[PDB]
Structure 1
Amino acid sequence: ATSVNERIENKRRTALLGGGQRRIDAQHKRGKLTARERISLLLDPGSFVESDMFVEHRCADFGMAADKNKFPGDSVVTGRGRINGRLVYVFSQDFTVFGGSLSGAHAQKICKIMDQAITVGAPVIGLNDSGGARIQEGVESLAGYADIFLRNVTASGVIPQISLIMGPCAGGAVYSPALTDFTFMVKDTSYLFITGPDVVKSVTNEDVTQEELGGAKTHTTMSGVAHRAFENDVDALCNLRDFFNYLPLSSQDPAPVRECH
């Protein structure tokens, strides 16, 4: 008798639930879906193939070596799927696990799918919901950001890259969306700012709320960072499919042609 079979099932059940049912409910009370629900809505039914499901973060400082601080998948869901029969690579950041903050494994998974996409010649769609870099992780959080930035710059003009900010993105998590070709936001739940309002008050001594500092309205009416804003997550993802139907699948391909009436 071997228990190496129930270990896989336990890790799978932990991976689907992410940061626990309580955090799923807290996410739901904010009017937000989870990463896997977003991926299911975006892609064609029964076409998502996940990669790096069991990946675990290798930090061992500040008491993160404990079992309670270990989440398989580690705050990002990556894979490939089909939109109307056309291949695409996708990652969605899970806000429940450590606030979606990027770590070594988070960046590792993102870089893996980006490398596959540039190898085969398919676009990348990134649903961003992340609190920045993992402070306890250390400098390799900066290393992971820099790897993601380098792959964003290398792939620019080779494959299309779409960004959709689904929640509050802060710190260094704002440069990868800026380096991609297009950027969309969701009203009333998505934010984009390098520095939070508290630090701004400490420094600039100006009382500014998060919505009016980095909200979708600010970035779509007076900043020039985002390209469009959508009412909620479902509407945003439907519009994302509609928009993806336009683009060529790679720079080696001609502009798509559809049947015309």
Structure 2
Amino acid sequence: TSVNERIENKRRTALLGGGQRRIDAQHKRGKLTARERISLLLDPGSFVESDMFVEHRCADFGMAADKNKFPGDSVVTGRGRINGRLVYVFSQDFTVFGGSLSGAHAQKICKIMDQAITVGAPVIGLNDSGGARIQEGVESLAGYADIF
């Protein structure tokens, strides 16, 4: 396949997060997905997403298998507008590894936080996560500190 087609494939996979069955399981709990929450929170057509294709770099415990690679890696980050005012938002995706925090997850959150501090806009975080990604060991801890 051409590079373009792989691009559409990655876009489509990322838009679904952890898969349709995971989304259904999320819904039966009475909870919305991360992207649905972002859509509800922001002004229509104002959401600009960042780092859609970022993936975790863990290579232990079979984490490098293609079935363990998710574009976005359990967090959706970007900017938008509320009633016309700029805001930066991150939403944790529970359907990807239970929303566990990995190196890429913390990296994306830190990127949006740095952008918000640079321009001087508020930050909103929708939190839904089991905890640290044990497979990444100390790496996860570091990310948490980077956020703190």
TM-score category, normalised to shorter length: over 0.9
Report the alpha carbon displacement of residue 135 of structure 1 after superposing the two structures with TM. Answer: 0.3
> What's the counterpart of residue 53 of structure 2?
54
Q: Secondary structure of 1:108's match?
A: helix
Report the alpha carbon displacement of residue 4 of structure 1 after superposing the two structures with TM. Answer: 0.3
> What's the counterpart of residue 145 of structure 2?
146
Report the alpha carbon displacement of residue 80 of structure 1 after superposing the two structures with TM. Answer: 0.1
Show CA shifts across 1:195-215 (max 9, x none): xxxxxxxxxxxxxxxxxxxxx
Structure 2: distance between partners of 1:25 and 1:126: 23
Report the alpha carbon displacement of residue 43 of structure 1 after superposing the two structures with TM. Answer: 0.1
Report the alpha carbon displacement of residue 109 of structure 1 after superposing the two structures with TM. Answer: 0.1
> What's the counterpart of residue 135 of structure 2?
136
Show CA shifts across 1:233-259 (max 9, x none): xxxxxxxxxxxxxxxxxxxxxxxxxxx
Q: Which is bigger in relative contact order (C-alpha 8 A, separation at least 6)?
A: 2
Report the alpha carbon displacement of residue 97 of structure 1 after superposing the two structures with TM. Answer: 0.1
Structure 1: distance between partners of 2:16 and 2:136: 23
Q: Secondary structure of 2:135's match?
A: coil
TM-score, L = length of structure 1: 0.56
Structure 1: distance between partners of 2:131 and 2:70: 18
Report the alpha carbon displacement of residue 56 of structure 1 after superposing the two structures with TM. Answer: 0.5
Structure 2: distance between partners of 1:24 and 1:114: 27
Report the alpha carbon displacement of residue 132 of structure 1 after superposing the two structures with TM. Answer: 0.5
Report the alpha carbon displacement of residue 75 of structure 1 after superposing the two structures with TM. Answer: 0.1
Q: Secondary structure of 2:124's match?
A: strand
Q: Secondary structure of 2:94's match?
A: coil
> What's the counterpart of residue 172 of structure 1?
none
Structure 2: distance between partners of 1:41 and 1:137: 32
Structure 2: distance between partners of 1:84 and 1:75: 28
Q: What 5-or-longer segments of structure 1 have no aligned partner?
A: 150-261
Structure 2: distance between partners of 1:113 and 1:136: 25
Matched residues, number? 148
Report the alpha carbon displacement of residue 62 of structure 1 after superposing the two structures with TM. Answer: 0.3
Report the alpha carbon displacement of residue 81 of structure 1 after superposing the two structures with TM. Answer: 0.1
Report the alpha carbon displacement of residue 125 of structure 1 after superposing the two structures with TM. Answer: 0.2
Report the alpha carbon displacement of residue 57 of structure 1 after superposing the two structures with TM. Answer: 0.3
> What's the counterpart of residue 33 of structure 2?
34
Report the alpha carbon displacement of residue 37 of structure 1 after superposing the two structures with TM. Answer: 0.1
After superposing on structure 2, the runs of 4+ consecutive aligned residues of structure 1 that deviate more than 6 Å are none
Report the alpha carbon displacement of residue 44 of structure 1 after superposing the two structures with TM. Answer: 0.1
Report the alpha carbon displacement of residue 139 of structure 1 after superposing the two structures with TM. Answer: 0.3
Structure 2: distance between partners of 1:20 and 1:132: 20
Report the alpha carbon displacement of residue 126 of structure 1 after superposing the two structures with TM. Answer: 0.2
Report the alpha carbon displacement of residue 124 of structure 1 after superposing the two structures with TM. Answer: 0.1
Q: Secondary structure of 1:19's match?
A: coil
Structure 2: distance between partners of 1:51 and 1:130: 20
Report the alpha carbon displacement of residue 145 of structure 1 after superposing the two structures with TM. Answer: 0.2
Show CA shifts across 1:69-128 (max 9, x none): 000000000000000000000000000000000000000000000000000000000000
Report the alpha carbon displacement of residue 8 of structure 1 after superposing the two structures with TM. Answer: 0.4
Report the alpha carbon displacement of residue 12 of structure 1 after superposing the two structures with TM. Answer: 0.2
Q: Secondary structure of 1:32's match?
A: coil
Structure 2: distance between partners of 1:138 and 1:59: 10
Structure 2: distance between partners of 1:101 and 1:148: 14
Show CA shifts across 1:33-57 (max 9, x none): 0000000000000000000000010
Q: Aligned ranges for residues 92-111 of structure 1 at < 5 Å? A: 92-111=91-110
